[PDB]
From a paper:
Plexin-B1 is a receptor for the cell surface semaphorin, Sema4D. pmcThe plexins are a family of cell surface single transmembrane domain receptors for cell surface and soluble semaphorins. The extracellular domains of plexins consist of three domain types: the IPT domain (immunoglobulin domain shared by plexins and transcription factors), the PSI domain (lexins, semaphorins, and integrins), and the sema domain. The sema domain is a seven-bladed β-propeller domain, with a large insert which gives the sema domain a distinctive, asymmetrical shape.
To further understand the mechanism of the VHHs inhibition of Sema4D binding to Plexin-B1, the structure of human Plexin-B1 (20–535) was solved by X-ray crystallography to a resolution of 2.69 Å, with the asymmetric unit containing two copies of hPlexin-B1. Several cadmium ions were found in the crystal structure, some of which support the crystal packing observed. Initial Cα RMSD comparisons of the two chains found in the apo human Plexin-B1 structure revealed that the PSI domain (480–535) undergoes significant loop movements within the crystal form, as do several loops in the sema domain. Contrary to what has been reported for Plexin-A2 (18), our analysis revealed significant loop movements in Plexin-B1 induced by Sema4D binding, which extend beyond the binding interface of Sema4D. The largest movements seen are up to 15.2 Å in the position of the A5-B5 loop. In the apo structure, this loop is folded over and interacts with the cleft between blades 5 and 6 of the sema domain. This region in the structure is the site to which the allosteric inhibitory peptide PB1m6 peptide binds to which was previously thought to be a preformed cleft in the sema domain. Regions of increased RMSD also identify that conformational changes are seen in several loops on both faces of the sema domain, such as the A3-B3 loop, the B3-C3 loop, B4-C4 loop, C4-D4 loop, B5-C5 loop, and the C6-D6 loop. The C6-D6 loop is adjacent to the cleft formed by the motion of the A5-B5 loop in the Sema4D bound structure and is further retracted from this region in the apo structure, presumably to allow space for the insertion of the A5-B5 loop in the apo structure reported here. The work presented here questions this paradigm by showing that the sema domain of Plexin-B1 undergoes significant structural rearrangement upon semaphorin binding.
Residue numbers in the entry:
A (entry chain A): 25 to 174, 177 to 301, 308 to 313, 317 to 514, 521 to 533
B (entry chain B): 24 to 174, 178 to 302, 309 to 313, 317 to 514, 521 to 533
Amino acid sequence: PTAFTPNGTYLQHLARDPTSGTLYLGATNFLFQLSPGLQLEATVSTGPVLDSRDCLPPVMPDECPQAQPTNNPNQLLLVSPGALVVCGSVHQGVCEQRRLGQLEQLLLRPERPGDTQYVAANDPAVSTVGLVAQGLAGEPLLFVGRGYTSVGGGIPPITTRALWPPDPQAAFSYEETAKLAVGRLSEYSHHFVSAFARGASAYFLFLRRDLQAQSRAFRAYVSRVCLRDQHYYSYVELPLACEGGRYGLIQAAAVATSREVAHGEVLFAAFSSAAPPSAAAGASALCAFPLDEVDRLANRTRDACYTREGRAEDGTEVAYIEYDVNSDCAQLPVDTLDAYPCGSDHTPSPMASRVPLEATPILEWPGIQLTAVAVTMEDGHTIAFLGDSQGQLHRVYLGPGSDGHPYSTQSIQQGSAVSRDLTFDGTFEHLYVMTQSTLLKVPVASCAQHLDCASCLAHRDPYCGWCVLLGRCSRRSECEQWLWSFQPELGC
Amino acid sequence: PPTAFTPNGTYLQHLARDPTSGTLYLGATNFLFQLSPGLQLEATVSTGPVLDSRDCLPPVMPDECPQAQPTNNPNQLLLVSPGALVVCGSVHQGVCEQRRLGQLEQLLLRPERPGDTQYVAANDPAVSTVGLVAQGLAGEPLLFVGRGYTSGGGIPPITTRALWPPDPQAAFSYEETAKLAVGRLSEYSHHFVSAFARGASAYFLFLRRDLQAQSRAFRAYVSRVCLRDQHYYSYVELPLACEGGRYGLIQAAAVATSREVAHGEVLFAAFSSAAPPSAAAGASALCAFPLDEVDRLANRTRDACYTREGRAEDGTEVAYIEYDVNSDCAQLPVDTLDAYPCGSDHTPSPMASRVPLEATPILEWPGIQLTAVAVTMEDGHTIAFLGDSQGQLHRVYLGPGSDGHPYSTQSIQQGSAVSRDLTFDGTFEHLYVMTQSTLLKVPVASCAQHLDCASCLAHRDPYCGWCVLLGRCSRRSECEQWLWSFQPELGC
Ligand SMILES: *[C@@H]1O[C@H](CO)[C@@H](O)[C@H](O)[C@H]1NC(C)=O
Ligand SMILES: *[C@@H]1O[C@H](CO)[C@@H](O)[C@H](O)[C@H]1NC(C)=O
């Protein structure tokens, strides 16, 4: 397969322009721009740089003597409509903007940024996530979820930051209210896995300590805010549960449309089991949460807390206000739900559900730590692409007939985890896979190398069958008119 | 096996369940807990240790309380009212506070400097405190409180107390007349067992020393008072007799509507025999007093004392004034009963019957000290769950067919008494059972773990039987043809 293996660096993040298909790659001291065929369109160096976590940028040796040279693994890498957003691990995680298609060309780098323009975690271990969307002021906003770091200030775990503000020197700053107001950051230890949009709703997947549970164990959550408000009124926090927390550490996730799973888009999540913040080598599972059910529970958490003091019509306590913020649920008129579906400066917030969103595992893999999810539907049925901590990429048919073991496994790079940033190309014919030292372009389905029916059906791959009338080892859509290679009792 | 809650380094005093939400509030040593209907911890509040002497008045500051010690705070009173949770501790003269139903952490009202008229619960952890939430004439929240004697002082045994006066800082106080005026509190030695309401009436269950008897012995009594009446004019005590005082000491009770026992509500009360103060380790009985017969005798006791100087038509003192109070039965015109059925500032008070309200044991178990009662009617016939002093929960069928021995018994916690806060859930599907160190959620029936008819019928449980259609071990409702597992002569 086609590869990109830059020497002298490690790969942190992969961002694909959905309009152009250009790939941008965020590595240690390098950004890359790649053709959709992994041809190198451009290269930008970003480090090492003189830095100390105690000094504030711009880091000069005069007012930062403790400075030492410091490598710069990539923290945020995002395709905004206007530009490419790049945030690093160095200089308190400040960000810059580069020309989409001309990585080499820098659009904007605040010259002397403030305590409010430190964006990413300035620790490459800690993890930063991000989403871009159009704001009500006309210009595009950048949501950022941010793990905890022990330096500078205490940055909020989620923030909504301006990318194209009036003064461009203020870009990446957030209005005083554009944040989740969370104290005790060190205690919650937010660990972000992913952020995504759909409809008017932004979603964040993350881990955080349950401070009311007896163990103060970590616990997986999905929270939803409205895409458009700079503010965090609509913020609703749901706990996630894959088999009621046997697999309690969400590792990666992907959205996809599948019809036999549920109507609407569906969130496929990979949870591991804990040994304390990380997985144990321990088992993994893949759960699916239909977003229309994510919205329905989140919707009825809002509806309870706005109009029924946090109770269902059943009478049950379902909703409350998390993070010890001074705010309780209310008995506002039901007209409120229509007038202000995303809240006001005076509605309850931040809202959380007492009811967990629960899913029974689609598959349960005993020895594996899943790190990466990619899901598509082919000729009616789900096929998952799953990467693990050991650099393997598993392909799993999930339709009828399957005990859900990988029909195919493949070693991208032994002993090095596959990235959540695992993404398909535009036609869905290929999947870009990335470990820490290589990025591969992998074909979903290599059917047509087979030039005889018996070779076709021996490939044994849900994508492949023998089109009888055309003498072709093809995919069903490309047609005894198609002899599926994934039905062993059958043959030529 | 049950779902449980076992908090470390604490003991459980009371459990109060919210009849609308089903959420459970626990009251413990230095702790409040809030738990889902499934016993998941939703919140925890510390209530101690505190600085305190029984000699000081709250708020205890060291500049006014030199003798203050670290003092633990076992819970004394835990009641869901309409707006808040009422909480009263054993410290700070037993003062009370209120907290948000559904967010216990959030507090609603805690008088800043309270008076001699606002020391509510017994400021000694070994003394009884019972309470009942009612509404006054103007439909505002009231709190009847019964408390045992405690060696500042003079707190009346029963008092009506305002949960939300005009002036929030006046909460939990009581108007000068809103009290049962007892002189010799040390001698009467009220031990309150329970308070409950039904109809227009509030009822209290307690022990007191009978000082008109030669024995001066402790005797079990039930007293009734009109809910509207906040001045205790209408107060009237009936002695309770379970096999003529063989079983002297009432221990726990629970009301239930049962078809085969009487019309209306019926009080199922567990009495124990006195040790030749408290129970011997002895024998217990379960006696049933229909509330309609309580009201009848209390009504005849009122009538006989208003209009016939306490005598019946044949001429016998059947009613008299108790508690060496200066008041006598009168020969008031008969129309006084219609004009003043709950008494006056000028009518006889407080009233007692000379005639005991009598009942004969539903069951008598020698060698068991019963401590907790819950009764339900299942398919027309009474079932009683009874806890005891050794943390054992006995299940008893009382329909036709039994010598009244338990068809099932479990250890909740060996040798630690089951609390009289034994209480069903909302579907009467489960039972919340608590000893001093654990809380359990017990299903009433474990029918369906049964696969074959043999096994089903071998459970020998009045709840379980074999639905012959459907082919599963169900309950008579979830069928209609059904083979009862509590009829041994019947097989399949
Ligand atoms: C959630 O609520 C929004 C607005 O209040 C509505 O547009 C949407 O249909 C709801 N989604 C559900 C009920 O799944
Ligand atoms: C007791 O008396 C009241 C009024 O005096 C009456 O309404 C009630 O029904 C009576 N209860 C009885 C007789 O059981």
